[PDB]
Write a protein that binds this ligand. Sequence first.
Ligand SMILES: Nc1ncnc2c1ncn2[C@@H]1O[C@H](COP(=O)(O)OP(=O)(O)OP(=O)(O)O)[C@@H](O)[C@H]1O
Ligand SMILES: Nc1ncnc2c1ncn2[C@@H]1O[C@H](COP(=O)(O)OP(=O)(O)OP(=O)(O)O)[C@@H](O)[C@H]1O
Lengths: 115, 115
Amino acid sequence: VLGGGCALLRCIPALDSLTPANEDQKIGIEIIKRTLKIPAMTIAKNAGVEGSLIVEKIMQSSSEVGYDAMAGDFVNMVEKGIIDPTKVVRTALLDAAGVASLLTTAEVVVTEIPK
Amino acid sequence: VLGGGCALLRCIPALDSLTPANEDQKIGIEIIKRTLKIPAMTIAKNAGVEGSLIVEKIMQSSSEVGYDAMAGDFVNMVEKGIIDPTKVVRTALLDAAGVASLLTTAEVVVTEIPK
Ligand SMILES: Nc1ncnc2c1ncn2[C@@H]1O[C@H](COP(=O)(O)OP(=O)(O)OP(=O)(O)O)[C@@H](O)[C@H]1O
Ligand SMILES: Nc1ncnc2c1ncn2[C@@H]1O[C@H](COP(=O)(O)OP(=O)(O)OP(=O)(O)O)[C@@H](O)[C@H]1O
């Protein structure tokens, strides 16, 4: 798939085409929708530029256009070779979500008293 | 002038039409140029939205269009009444710059030892 976090950026309208069952499911869908911009934002922030403007410029562009943080330019990602494995992206997303959504269900935390 | 920090936002091409004498003057001009977006960003950030995207949408718009953070939408701001005194804007800019650029010239700081 496309590299630079653009592959997760192109799946936001798939979440926009979802009908939640209730308000809490809608909250979770919005959480994932806001999370989907995080890798591209982090890559752009590590390059010294403002990641939100870069992310908005990526979503306002065509589906083949992403941000090259090395050259700092908006390019064709397949033609420039900036590509990612699909397995890596889905594995990272699923493994992050499964533990973080379970962590957010907590009300009580029990720890050992430090000796 | 226009309110919402847009009056300082419309003076950025006036800085783009400047020729610095050396590199340090260029650094100072860039400092003021980056500072000119700060009040609109702060107003948008206090409203719960991302201020950088709002600022970019303001500069991509016409000269009469700004952001109403009360209604959260982009409007003709003379017609909507969001206006500022010119004296207040220039007083704030000059009073901030005069002390802050002198503060940034410091190399040594001498303080009294706390008793
Ligand atoms: N020139 C580039 N422009 C834009 N994005 C790029 C560029 N080169 C790599 N990337 C992106 O940066 C990410 C790679 O980051 P990095 O390899 O440091 O971390 P990771 O793969 O998440 O984890 P790990 O630390 O295990 O390697 C991928 O999303 C890749 O598509
Ligand atoms: N509805 C609005 N939409 C957008 N900007 C607005 C709106 N109402 C006011 N503003 C802007 O917000 C700023 C006013 O902020 P505020 O009065 O809290 O601070 P100040 O004038 O800098 O200082 P002081 O605390 O001394 O009043 C002005 O720039 C004004 O144009």
